[PDB]
Write a protein that binds this DNA or RNA. Structure first.
Length: 115
RNA sequence: UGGUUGUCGUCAGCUCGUGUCGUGAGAUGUUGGGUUAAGUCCCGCAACGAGCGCAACCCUUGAUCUUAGUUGCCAGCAUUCA
């Protein structure tokens, strides 16, 4: 079922054998995904992500491509969660506390320029 | 041995935290592009920072404003060997 989408999906010769369970093959040389194996997977993603945003860890939305910038930004500012619109800084999660320091610095200085 | 100095060298380096990579020694930052007197600064980056250095503040000289005119100065006021 094509619900709304446009994705046949991507790549030429550089492709991964671990997606043999998901794709088809066009005579173009660019691969077309079996969308019947797409609708059910986004359905389970939909359900489990409803459960996760029902429990209360917020959600990270991270997109670090020129296509991904305005999309992930506007979508997370629509949903209220935590986005990445530019580079993904090395160690936001495993190095979490020194990023909390630098974001508190940003909070101090953006309060400082008006208060 | 303390303390105090030379020298590399006023060279621009030397490190650390947390993270990640590596079996480990180590790596990373600190590399790359431009830039600088400068690891100076920017941009990209598995890194984000920080410290000692670099620079700046400090002293002098270069100029002008205010205060302050004696022992310093003599512009217009006359006398003076001055």
């Amino acid at each position: 079922l094509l619900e709304a989408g446009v994705h046949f999906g991507h790549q030429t010769r550089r492709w991964n054998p671990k997606m043999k369970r998901y794709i088809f093959t066009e005579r173009n040389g660019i691969y077309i995904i079996d969308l019947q194996k797409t609708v059910k997977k986004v359905e389970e993603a939909y359900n489990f992500t409803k459960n996760l945003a029902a429990e209360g860890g917020k959600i990270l939305f991270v997109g670090t491509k020129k296509q991904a910038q305005d999309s992930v930004k506007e979508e997370a500012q629509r949903s209220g969660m935590y986005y990445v619109n530019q580079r993904w800084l090395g160690g936001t999660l495993t190095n979490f506390e020194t990023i909390q320091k630098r974001i508190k610095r940003l909070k101090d200085i953006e309060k400082m320029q008006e208060n």
